[PDB]
């Protein structure tokens, strides 16, 4: 279906000694494909998916050059924002940046985004028109006026509608064997008696990709809200994801209850019931 490419940057200052810790990760959909860690030994942008290793040395030299420059930009920003907010040199602070582009199922541009946060709160973000900025506070409007002067939204809109979608489209074909494969959830139901009159039914979705999924409980064909627990989708560690939903039922009444599983890898949604 639809697809995205996204880059995530975190930089954390170290007041006690040295320069900030800097971590950058790149994703196509839910697949991490590149990484950079300032405390790693290589000091290079590194591959994390087999289909990006095909790329030649021009690619890896350029991506290393870029990400190391971005590390320095965040370093400067950490100092600048420390002044904007009148904070001491004694504390540790955080800058985070995320940007990327989505394409539709026809692999054509859908939307772009570029967002910036200081100490875990919105600082400045590009609006969906890719022309305007949302500044969260007055420090951020200082940045906004600076970026209006420097044509920043211009360059971002060019990349996000052009370069970004072009290279996403290149990755999708080079990595076709995994990136365009859907892994539908392997589902089953487990039963856990909690007394001689009550039991937990747990509906499991395992080893699925992409991470987006809906698990819902129904009782007698209608949405069951009470006594349900739904955990956050979580990585399996092998590139796929897991999720479960549970409901407490009176013992012997298990058949009234159905778990419903929606996922891009299933042509029609799935229905499970304890026997």
């Amino acid at each position: 279906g639809s697809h995205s490419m996204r880059y995530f940057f975190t930089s954390v200052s170290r007041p006690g000694r040295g320069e900030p810790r800097f971590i950058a990760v790149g994703y196509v959909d839910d697949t991490q494909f590149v990484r950079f860690d300032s405390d790693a030994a290589s000091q290079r942008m590194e591959p994390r998916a087999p289909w990006i290793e095909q790329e030649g040395p021009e690619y890896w030299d350029g991506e290393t050059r870029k990400v190391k420059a971005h590390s320095q930009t965040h370093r400067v920003d950490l100092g600048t924002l420390r002044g904007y907010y009148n904070q001491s040199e004694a504390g540790s602070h955080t800058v985070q940046r995320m940007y990327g582009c989505d394409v539709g199922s026809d692999w054509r541009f859908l939307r772009g985004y570029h967002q910036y946060a200081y100490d875990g709160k919105d600082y400045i973000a590009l609006k969906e028109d890719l022309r305007s900025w949302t500044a969260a506070d007055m420090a951020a409007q200082t940045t906004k006026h600076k970026w209006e002067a420097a044509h920043v939204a211009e360059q971002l809109r060019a990349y996000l509608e052009g370069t970004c979608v072009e290279w996403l489209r290149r990755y999708l074909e080079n990595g076709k064997e995994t990136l365009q494969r859907t892994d539908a959830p392997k589902t089953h139901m487990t039963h856990h008696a909690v007394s001689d009159h009550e039991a937990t039914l747990r509906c499991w979705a395992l080893s699925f990709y992409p991470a987006e999924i809906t698990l819902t409980w129904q009782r007698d064909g209608e949405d069951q809200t009470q006594d349900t627990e739904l955990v956050e989708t979580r990585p399996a560690g092998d590139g796929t994801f897991q999720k479960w939903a549970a409901v407490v039922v009176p013992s012997g009444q298990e058949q009234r209850y159905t778990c419903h599983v929606q996922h891009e890898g299933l042509p029609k949604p799935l229905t499970l019931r304890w026997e």
Binding site: Y7, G26, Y59, G62, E63, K66, V67, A69, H70, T73, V76, D77, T80, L81, R97, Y99, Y116, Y123, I124, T143, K146, W147, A150, V152, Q155, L156, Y159, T163, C164, W167
Partner: peptide
């Protein structure tokens, strides 16, 4: 592929 340049805040 990363964006080539980020202006400072």
């Amino acid at each position: 592929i990363l964006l080539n340049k980020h202006i400072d805040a």
